Amino acid sequence: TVKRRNHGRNKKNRGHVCGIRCSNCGRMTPKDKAVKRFIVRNMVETAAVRDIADASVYYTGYNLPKLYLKMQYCISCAIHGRIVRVRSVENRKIRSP
Amino acid sequence: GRMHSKGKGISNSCLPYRRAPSWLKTSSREVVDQICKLAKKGVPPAQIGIQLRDSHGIGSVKSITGRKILRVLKHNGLAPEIPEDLYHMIKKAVNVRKHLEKSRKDKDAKFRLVLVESRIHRLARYYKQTKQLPATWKYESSTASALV
Amino acid sequence: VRQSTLADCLKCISNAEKRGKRQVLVRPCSKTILRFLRVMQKHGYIGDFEVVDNHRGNKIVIELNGRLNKCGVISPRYDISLPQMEKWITSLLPSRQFGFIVLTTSHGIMDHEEARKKHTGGKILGFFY
Amino acid sequence: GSISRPRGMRRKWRKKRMKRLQRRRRKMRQRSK
Amino acid sequence: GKPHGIRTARKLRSHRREQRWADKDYNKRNLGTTLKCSPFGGTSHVKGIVLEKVGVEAKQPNSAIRKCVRV
Amino acid sequence: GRVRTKTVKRASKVIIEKYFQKLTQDFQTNKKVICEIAIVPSTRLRNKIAGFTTKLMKRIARGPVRGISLKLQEEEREKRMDFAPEVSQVDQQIMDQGVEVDEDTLAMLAAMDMANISHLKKVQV
Amino acid sequence: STFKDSNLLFPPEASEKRKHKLKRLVQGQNSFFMDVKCPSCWAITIVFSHVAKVVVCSSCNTVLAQPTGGKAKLTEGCSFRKKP
Amino acid sequence: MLNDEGINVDAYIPRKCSATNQLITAKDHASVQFNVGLIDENGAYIGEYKTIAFAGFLRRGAASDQALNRLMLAANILKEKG
Amino acid sequence: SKGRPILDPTEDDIRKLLACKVHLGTKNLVKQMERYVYARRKDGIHVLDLHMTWQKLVLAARVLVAIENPADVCAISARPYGQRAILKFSQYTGAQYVASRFTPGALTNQIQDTFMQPRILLITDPRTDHQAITESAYGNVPVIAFCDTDSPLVYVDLAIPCNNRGQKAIGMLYWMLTREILRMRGTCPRAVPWEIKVDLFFYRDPE
Amino acid sequence: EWIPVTKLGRLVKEAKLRKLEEIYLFSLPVKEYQIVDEFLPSPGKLKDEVMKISPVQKQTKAGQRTRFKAYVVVGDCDGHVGLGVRCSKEVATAIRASIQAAKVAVIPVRRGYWGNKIGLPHTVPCKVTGKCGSCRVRLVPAPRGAGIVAAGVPKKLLQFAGVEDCFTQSIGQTRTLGNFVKATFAALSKTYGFLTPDLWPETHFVKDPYQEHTDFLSQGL
RNA sequence: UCUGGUGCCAGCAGCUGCGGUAAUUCCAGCUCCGAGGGCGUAUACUAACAUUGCUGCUGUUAAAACACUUGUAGUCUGCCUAC
RNA sequence: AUCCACUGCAGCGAAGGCGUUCUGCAAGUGCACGUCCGUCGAUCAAGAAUGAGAGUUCGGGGAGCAAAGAUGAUCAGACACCGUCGUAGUCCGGCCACUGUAAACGAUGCCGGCCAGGCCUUGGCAGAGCAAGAAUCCUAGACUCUGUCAGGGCCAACGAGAAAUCCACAGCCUGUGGGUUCAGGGGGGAGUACUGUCGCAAGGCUGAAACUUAAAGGAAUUGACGGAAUGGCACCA
RNA sequence: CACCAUGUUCAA
Ligand SMILES: [Zn+2]
């Protein structure tokens, strides 16, 4: 009952992979087993972009600064905060978004 | 490179089919004289062959004078006391020991030293069997330094 | 590492026949290998074969004709008397009618039927059917 | 879940109970000898 | 795998001999502790004196009382 | 919801394919047409079939409804598809602009024969 | 493009040019020798294609080929011609 | 096969793949049999043909097309470029 | 075509093939089709020699003409480019054909309405007609396919190097094939160009 | 009563095909047991046996559904044998459909000689092995007076296939009757599969029935 | 799928199981089956058993690849030398 | 103390393991080659050298985190999860400190031969290209294509398998033999007892039996369930 | 992401 051909991780030709810490839980998870997402947001969402750009001087729409986060998750917190969802046995082989 | 590693490489040279290319008017006495000239200068057989292959157009000394390089060295009294395989392995072990004796906590120089000394003994066994080395011969770390 | 060139040759030939190849390359060649191949030819399980000179353990190209089912080597080369011939037949061959055991005997590398008819035993060397 | 049916308690914890038992035994035999 | 090769007779025989000890039937037959420990010291029948009667509750799913005697 | 059943749809389809020349886009005359065409045991079923047929006829009027075969129009489409132009488009094309043939395709036509043939454009990539 | 199943005994030139110097049907050399001359002189040195160390003139001692990882790199202007 | 009298005891001697030499068994529903027509000099087809049986093993290994190529080269049908 | 010169291609035929682009492959290659590709263009397309294309075309013609009772031949094409071609091919040879979607189990399900038990079947594209090839395997019928340079010729017995993805390429190939099949049997002559155009085989949209 | 569906059905209904080897020679699918009932009549030239009727259960909510797999062997003792495994909800229909499937799956069993070729073939021509699941079943050629030395399932299959002598070596979970009978059936199948010097010579292809009766087959449409 | 008694009791039963008031299995009666001047029981060993595997086992997950290299004894070792 | 992002179906190392920059020291693999030797090799009981983390020893260090402990909640209990602290420990050095175990895993011994196709990637070597800053010159370690050797993977035939699955192997296996080492023989008792040996200790290695039991177990299926996910729904919500 | 422990024996 090996569930994954790569046993939940992308470690190949390695022996040891650095252990990183989950973003919220704080769990030590291998760097390749972790579900990692580099997310880019804005300091301001469109619920406030007009209200701030109307009072800004050096900014406007399409100009506000961004947030670059790189959230790394353990499998538990990924599945709970629904970053990832359980997939079918046949749809587990899908590796592109 | 398969003996003491996971290496599976095959990069070795490959002779022709001929066994002289109809050029190289140079003949046996000349090539042997060249061999002995650059053997007097301390150059070992493997380097003799390369210095005679690169710029002199003499590949496969054997083909010009059927005696291989070590044969023509022994036939002129210029062959070393210990074969160059052993000699270079001894020198490598000497350097590794010299290193780790001060880098006392390498723990990988130690492993590679175990390997190179195992090779040294596996080859010294063969040479003692073939009588190229004296029957009493033995590789000691403490005295190998005074051979290079 | 590289035991029994004959074993490697026979396994290559059997794998080629199994894959359906019409000619197989074998590397290197030996006297034992050539005599085994000639014993196969004599009964027609093997087409022509020719040796290409490497100057380094010459190689062989055998032409296969679909009549082979299996070539194998029996290692170690057990000794075989004439009473043991029937034991080896009933254990190795698929039938008592066709298929052959190759034996190295004091009379050269020999078929098992030829060995039985000219009254000699020897060391087993393989089989083909 | 990650494993199939230990037919007792967790093998790590019964291994640990065995180790504690073993050194209690060791102390009782060191009493005598 | 096992050693083929025409001079591995000692290896093969010693391995078979040291490995036969994992057959529990052979092991109990050859290990001289059953003649010692078993009450029938290698014997079909023995004679004894009835010491007491015993009612033994049958194992699940059965619920009888088997009548035995301590001998 | 008012999703129809196949006992209505598959009857609408054959009624259309057999009587497209008689029906209209009017429900209450398609009703009187079907009440003489079909033997429907129920008037509610008659009216469901009639309404679905009027819907399909309205879609016919609108545009190409995918799923019916009006023969007296599909024979027309078939015979126009089977109409022959006097000159094959490929013939007049090789007359007008020859044929664009690349470097290695000229190399292949030279490898075989047909190398020095007419109407080539000698194009390269 | 042949329609023919190339037998191993007579292999095509295209495929046999690609093969490793060992995995050919007959193992052969993957090198050659060169007659080489520098404009600074006339002596025709005979060098190896894949030189292992530096090669200089017999008299001028000006480097002709300089060793690299693979084939030799002949110096600026040194004319060369492959030998049979 | 016969029985020492020259009397064929084997019913249904099967047919063999023409590329390999392997027997086509009684359940090889992937095997095929052909008829490549023969043609006179004037381009017409006389009712003559060369027959070719292929085995399901070949037709799975995908060497059936190249086997046909080889067989027609042997039978002087496919024209080599030259 | 080996001994027969009258079956060799004509200059006009090669011109109208190069026109319909049947000499062009795709950026992908199969090692079983590597034998029919002459070379590559520096944009990647594999040009495949109309010589071998014509050899395999006249070979398929030989098989199709040796097959008497042409109603035992089924042309198959699933993609839109090719259905008009197979319809015309059936019309002019006597063969049978199928619609866009091959009903799975025709060549296996005996109690099926669309049984279609042929003696041979001619397939436009293997990658698209993967089904009929499988049922061929299950039913012992040979397969003659128009194999592009990107085509699994697993159960294909007679592959023909083609394009399979050009609406005029398919029409051209089926026109050539039916022309050869009608030249054989003594129905069509050689010198006289036969009256049916190639424009009838190409794919025309409904409107 | 039996309106033939396939070309083989029509040919055997109209006596264009003579007997089974005419279909075996081209390996054509049968798909209709009426063909083999035409060539081997029901009572006499074909005996059928029911080896086992095993219930299998699919669990459902509110109960569990039980259905019987019937294993039926079909054969006359001259070299033909077939194996049909068919589920059904009732034992009657299971057995009937299994007889039909076994009749469709009837195959020819090559028979050979162990030693001298004196009379008629009596044993398997070669050592054969059949696989299904873990059950490997080896059929070994036995001499004239050895008899069938199999165990029940292979014994009756070999009896039906009409071999007089055979040694066997079953290796798997032989108590699984399904696989244990499929293995020996597969072995009897490989019997003709193995190639011998007897079959070394030329092929000499023939017209298949479809080509040979193309004119007849093009009328019933 | 016999008849009476018993009613998870008595008991049977190598294993699976039978016995809880309609027991095809207990206690009996009748009947029937098997070996038969014999049959049962217990114990030991053999075969079954390719479940000790030389022929001839298995080792990803069922029992079982040493953490990993080295390395002695042991085992095994490339091509060639007469018409 | 630790070296984010870069950081990956990337590389290296016998494995454990290895990530800031400059630098000292020795080393390895691969590749290239008409260099040398000339069988010197494969696997290996005993033996030897490395061996995560925990643990121990001697001397320092102590930010952060944290067994034990303290302590506030939660709870029926809660010296549990949760929260606040907190000691050993984690960090450094040592006769070359000791130990010598891990789901030390690819749960897959090592050497050798053969094994369809397609795709990605690492390092060379070879041959080409429309292929690169400042400029426009000029070359350039960049990029593209092809071949090949070595490495790391992915998906796809035959075959194998109980299946899951394997696929440069878990294929070539009842059509069974290339060579070699280790281990297993129903489940427990038990990796226990005794003994031996190593260690400061913890403990490692070695390692039974009496007795007990008919199943343990593996893969897969159908249903049921879920304080699992998704999507529909009901005033018996 | 408060807390949500349990269900006598054989039989089906
Ligand atoms: Zn988390």
Author numbering:
A (entry chain Sb): 2 to 98
B (entry chain ST): 2 to 20, 22 to 150
C (entry chain SJ): 2 to 130
D (entry chain L3): 2 to 34
E (entry chain SP): 2 to 72
F (entry chain SV): 2 to 126
G (entry chain Sc): 2 to 85
H (entry chain SY): 1 to 82
Text of the article:
To unravel the architecture of the E. gracilis ribosome we purified intact 80S ribosomes and assembled in vitro a ternary complex with mRNA and tRNAs. Multibody refinement followed by particle polishing resulted in an improved density map with an overall resolution of 3 Å for the entire particle, and 3.0, 3.02 and 3.13 Å for the LSU, SSU-body and SSU-head, respectively. The final map allowed us to build, refine and validate the complete model of the Euglena ribosome, including all sixteen rRNA components (18S, 5.8S, 5S and the thirteen segments comprising the 28S rRNA), three tRNAs, an mRNA and a total of 34 RPs for the SSU and 41 for the LSU. Notable structural changes are most prominent in the SSU, which exceeds the size of a typical 40S particle and bears extended RNA segments in the body region, as well as harboring an additional RP (termed here eSEug1). For the LSU, all of the rRNA segments were readily visible, indicating that although the rRNA in this ribosome is highly fragmented, the RNA segments interact extensively to form the universally conserved ribosome backbone. Notable differences were observed in the protein composition of the LSU, and include the absence of RP eL28 and the presence of three Euglena-specific proteins, denoted here as eLEgr1, eLEgr2 and eLEgr3. The cryo-EM structure reveals that, as in kinetoplastids, the Euglena LSU shares a similar fold with other eukaryotic ribosomes, and although the number of LSU rRNA segments in this ribosome species is doubled compared to kinetoplastids, its RNA chain termini also face the solvent-exposed region, clustering in focal points that largely overlap those observed in trypanosomatids. The E. gracilis ribosome is decorated with a total of 349 rRNA modifications, the highest number of ribosomal modifications reported to date. Our cryo-EM analysis enabled the direct visualization of 186 Nm residues in the Euglena ribosome, revealing their 3D context. A notable feature of this ribosome is a cluster of five m1A residues localized to a distinctive LSU rRNA expansion segment on the ribosomal surface and adjacent to the protein exit tunnel.
Ribosomes are macromolecular ribonucleoprotein (RNP) assemblies that function together with transfer RNA (tRNA) in translating messenger RNA (mRNA) into protein. The LSU rRNA of Euglena differs from the typical rRNA in eukaryotes as it is uniquely fragmented into 14 segments. In summary, the Euglena cytoribosome is an unusual RNP, which is distinct from other ribosomes in that it harbours four unique core ribosomal proteins, while its LSU rRNA is highly fragmented. The RNAs in this ribosome species (particularly the LSU rRNA) are also substantially enriched in post-transcriptional modifications, which are spread far beyond the catalytic RNA core, likely contributing to the stabilization of rRNA fragments.
